[PDB]
Paper text:
Among such receptors is macrophage-inducible C-type lectin (Mincle, gene symbol CLEC4E), a member of the C-type lectin receptor (CLR) family, which functions as an immune sensor for both pathogens and damaged self. Mincle recognizes its ligands via a calcium-dependent sugar-binding site, containing a conserved EPN (Glu-Pro-Asn) motif, and a hydrophobic groove on the carbohydrate recognition domain (CRD), which are in combination the major characteristics of Mincle. In Takifugu rubripes, one of the first vertebrates whose whole genome was completely sequenced, a protein sequence bearing the EPN motif and a hydrophobic groove was found (XP_029706534.1). Altogether, trMincle shares similar characteristics with mammalian Mincle in its amino acid sequence and its FcRγ-dependent cell surface expression.
As trMincle was predicted to be a type II transmembrane protein, we constructed the extracellular domain of trMincle as a soluble recombinant protein followed by column-based purification. The crystal structure of trMincle was determined at 1.7 Å resolution. A calcium ion was coordinated with Glu-Pro-Asn (EPN) and Trp-Asn-Asp (WND), two well-conserved motifs, suggesting the typical sugar-binding pocket observed in other mammalian C-type lectins was also present in trMincle. Furthermore, one glycerol molecule in the media interacted with the EPN motif within the hydrophilic pocket, and hydroxyl groups at C1 and 2 of glycerol formed coordination bonds with calcium ion, which is similar to the reported sugar-binding mode of mammalian Mincle.Fig. 2 trMincle is structurally similar to boMincle. Indeed, overall, both fish and mammalian Mincle possessed hydrophilic pockets and adjacent grooves;, although the amino acid residues were not identical. Moreover, the molecular dynamics simulation suggested that the trMincle CRD can create a typical groove similar to a mammalian Mincle. The crystal structure of trMincle suggests the formation of a stable homodimer.
Residue numbers in the entry:
A (entry chain E): 47 to 180
B (entry chain A): 45 to 180
Write the structure that this text describes.
């Protein structure tokens, strides 16, 4: 907890044993992830309903750390764990209009909230997560 | 350690920054009813005490009521804990009693060219941020 002060000074904040960072620029999924990795973190991994509610309450469209396995329409978190519990928004994931949508955003729009597969080269604000406590 | 203090608030969606727990509402409300919610939860509207805390507030990219209110019509300001305003982060041209109307309550405004505090009519609605200072 004394260890958290330099993170707070950089604008990270603490929820349920992880530190989180919300970007102030948008970027592609891969470059977003590169920022998080450079900070010793990764894109956010949603492990519980409470964490999804925390994510949603920022009212912000955000890249998160979930990516398709090639074109198989199966999904894996950035730490290598397989997708189990999911929070896809209505009608997602869908490879919209036949385009390859391999990366996952939390979408925040009126009538439409939750995860969406999106073209990875599109840009979004992004959320990093770093596990601190065991 | 500190988790016995924190986990019941994490369980309600609060989150921890510096010595405080913070709550972002999921409904909009008037400044006074926003405050009433924070008070009911054992907290108050957010009080900005440092540049780092202002940067934290601003990075949520969200217009939010905060715990700063005018003293009557005197154009002086006091935080909800009774402390006088010292360091400030007003957006450009604020506070201004816009168009002659009484703007006694303070929001953090998030718009494309303009960020920072704004005085606004208290009866208008915004999302709000509560703060509960939990650690000494
Ligand atoms: Ca997580
Ligand atoms: Ca999609
Ligand atoms: Ca404060
Ligand atoms: Ca104003």
């Amino acid at each position: 907890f004394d260890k958290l002060d330099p993170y707070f000074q950089q604008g990270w904040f603490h929820f349920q044993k992880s530190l989180y960072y919300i970007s102030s620029v948008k970027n592609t999924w891969h470059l977003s992830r590169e920022y998080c990795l450079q900070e010793g973190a990764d894109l956010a991994i949603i492990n519980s309903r409470a964490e999804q509610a925390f994510l949603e309450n920022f009212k912000m469209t955000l890249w998160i750390g979930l990516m398709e396995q090639r074109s198989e329409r199966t999904w894996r978190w950035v730490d290598g764990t397989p997708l189990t519990e999911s929070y896809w928004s209505l009608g997602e994931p869908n490879n919209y209009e036949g385009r390859q949508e391999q990366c996952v955003e939390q979408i925040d729009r009126e009538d439409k909230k939750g995860w969406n597969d999106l073209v990875c080269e599109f840009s979004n604000f992004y959320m990093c997560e770093k596990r601190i406590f065991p």
